[PDB]
Amino acid sequence: YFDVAEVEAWLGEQELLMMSEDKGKDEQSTLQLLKKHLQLEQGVENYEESIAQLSRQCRARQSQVDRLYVALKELGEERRVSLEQQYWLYQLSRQVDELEHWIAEKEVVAGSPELGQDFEHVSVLQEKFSEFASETGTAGRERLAAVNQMVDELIECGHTAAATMAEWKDGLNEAWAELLELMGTRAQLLAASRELHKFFSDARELQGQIEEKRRRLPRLTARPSASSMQRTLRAFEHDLQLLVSQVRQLQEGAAQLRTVYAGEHAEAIASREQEVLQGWKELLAACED
Amino acid sequence: FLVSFMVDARGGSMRGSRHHGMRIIIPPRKCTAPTRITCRLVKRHKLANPPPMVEGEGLASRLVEMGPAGAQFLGPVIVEIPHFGSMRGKERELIVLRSENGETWKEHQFDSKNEDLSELLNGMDEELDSPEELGTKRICRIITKDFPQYFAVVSRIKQESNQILSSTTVPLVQASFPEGALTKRIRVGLQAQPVPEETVKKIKATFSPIVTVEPRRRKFHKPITMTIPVPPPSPSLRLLCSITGGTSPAQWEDITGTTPLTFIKDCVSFTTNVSARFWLADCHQVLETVGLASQLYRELICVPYMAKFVVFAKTSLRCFCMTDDRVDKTLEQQENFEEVARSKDIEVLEGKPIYVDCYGNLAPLTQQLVFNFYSFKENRLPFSITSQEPCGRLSFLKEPTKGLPQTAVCNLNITLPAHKKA
């Protein structure tokens, strides 16, 4: 009866230590508490090499205590799983929150509406975005897949709060494909702001090429010489016959352009191209006489 | 699309990938420019100052944040939003709110409605069948030429409105304002909610339509006539009224003495001077007619919804009542479950708990079981499951009793997959 007084007492204090009302406070708590749980479990398992003295003493109340080792190592094989859970929860949560804030931070860049003030630099913004398209696209695919499979692992385990992890999975994957879409919109918006500007600047270079021509004709009739008279005139004709090839692409651009826009915008495209064709007439008439 | 898409003045015919029904249409030459159009059904809980509802009015869909807060279209455009409000064949209607900035809530309306002209030779015109077809498909067509920041869809009662007024639901409910009783010739509406006898069984003593005049708690300068049809049978007759207005719920009281009760075949004409809730009750005990009304009233004000009933199983059951959720439920398809029965669309009571009985292969483990249906929430009902019988059918009922048969709501037939036992 030294047995039922000393060993029953040892398992008496073993039960109290292992059983606990602390499941784990923060992420790095559960961990440095679970370490302690694996110490306690190995100490219970290393009390299997002291129950051969009790078995020998009894064999040469026994059914009461024969169960208590399998019960304190089933309480071990349960509260090990509870602490594992409470860590993995804190991990998955932190990954989710941080990932939401990544979708968050990148969302702002997508949703920005700056479509420039001129061709050159909106044509920059085109690139400065399309890079972010890939960086975000692929890097997201990654972070998504990693977190997704974090959940699917915790599911197949059979975590207590998996349901929440499911609606977290949807809550992420949805907002993700939303992001993808959003970038695909932004992209197109930029493409249009581009073509629109390309038009505008093409006007600013044609109205200028022509407003040069019509100005430089008086110079080409007046100082002078006969041997560089016909040659100069024929060369100007060589120019104008390429200016027409350019403006065919100008009118032919304006047409496809009007069809995309409407109202104040289309009414302004009208006045721009009407203005430049009017410059065409005011050169065209001069070059007859 | 899922939430957004860009569109130019070539016009776009875009349906919503995520929520079946959703469909924005922008006809050609109607968008200001290429623009980001959006249409997201935000959760009711997430928002603040949600559009105010009254006693008996009901939220049909979620709220729908739109893509351009202030876009002003040249033409008109359509937003088909799908709802789940029970319509009950004109016993209820759908009024469409709009908030410009999610603080101020106004009704939204367009005076002119046309089919062939709004589309402007749109190739896939695809007007969705007839308007009745929309009413059957639980679609609400909103037509605007400028996108307000937030729409609501709402199921009121029919409130036929003018600025003489008889109800489009029940015609023996003619309530006409007399000459010169209103200072400003203002719109006024007449609502007419009947009562099914079938539900009078719930809690004996009879009732008439619940008549209401929409501009409430506003005194009428010259007495205003009323006509209400009478209940059938079981002083005997008491008339009730509540004067409370708008957001707050009403309260009832007997006012037989203060009102002269003129009789005409099938109904009752009388005067009041205040716009309020009127309701009749023939029964020969008067002290109860207040509370026996407000017990019944509680039942009538609940909102109806055409909900789907789906049962998921995996050897072992999880039962669901839902609307507007993605069908491919991730939680269950991952836990390896099988949708064993997805039922037709069924009017259920946003509040009233719904019961389940089992007429099947095996009984439930080990009290009766119930789960309260709410609108736009997922509704969990988990389970625990002669060996000759392969399959079984379970059914859902609004009444629990075994004295009289209170017929059920939904009969569904199930089949365990039986990859193992338990």
UniProtKB/Swiss-Prot annotation, chain B:
Residues bearing the modification Phosphoserine: S130
Domain of life the protein comes from: Eukaryota
Subcellular location: Cytoplasm, Cytoskeleton; Cell projection, Axon; Cell membrane; Cell membrane, Sarcolemma
Stretches assigned to the ZU5 domain: 1-156, 158-283
Expression sites by tissue: Expressed in the heart (at protein level). Expressed in skeletal muscle (at protein level). Expressed at highest levels in brain and testis, followed by skin, kidney, liver and spleen.
Record's subunit section: May be a constituent of a NFASC/NRCAM/ankyrin G complex. Interacts with RHBG. Directly interacts with DMD and betaDAG1; this interaction does not interfere with DMD-binding and is required for DMD and betaDAG1 retention at costameres. Interacts (via N-terminal ANK repeats) with SCHIP1 isoform 7 (via C-terminus); this interaction is required for the localization at axon initial segments (AISs) and nodes of Ranvier (NRs). Interacts with PLEC and FLNC. Interacts (via ANK repeats) with IQCJ-SCHIP1; required for IQCJ-SCHIP1 localization at axon initial segments (AIS) and nodes of Ranvier.
Its job: Membrane-cytoskeleton linker. May participate in the maintenance/targeting of ion channels and cell adhesion molecules at the nodes of Ranvier and axonal initial segments. In skeletal muscle, required for costamere localization of DMD and betaDAG1. Regulates KCNA1 channel activity in function of dietary Mg(2+) levels, and thereby contributes to the regulation of renal Mg(2+) reabsorption.
Protein name: Ankyrin-3
Native organism: Rattus norvegicus (Rat)
Source taxonomy: Eukaryota, Metazoa, Chordata, Craniata, Vertebrata
Name of the gene this protein is made from: Ank3
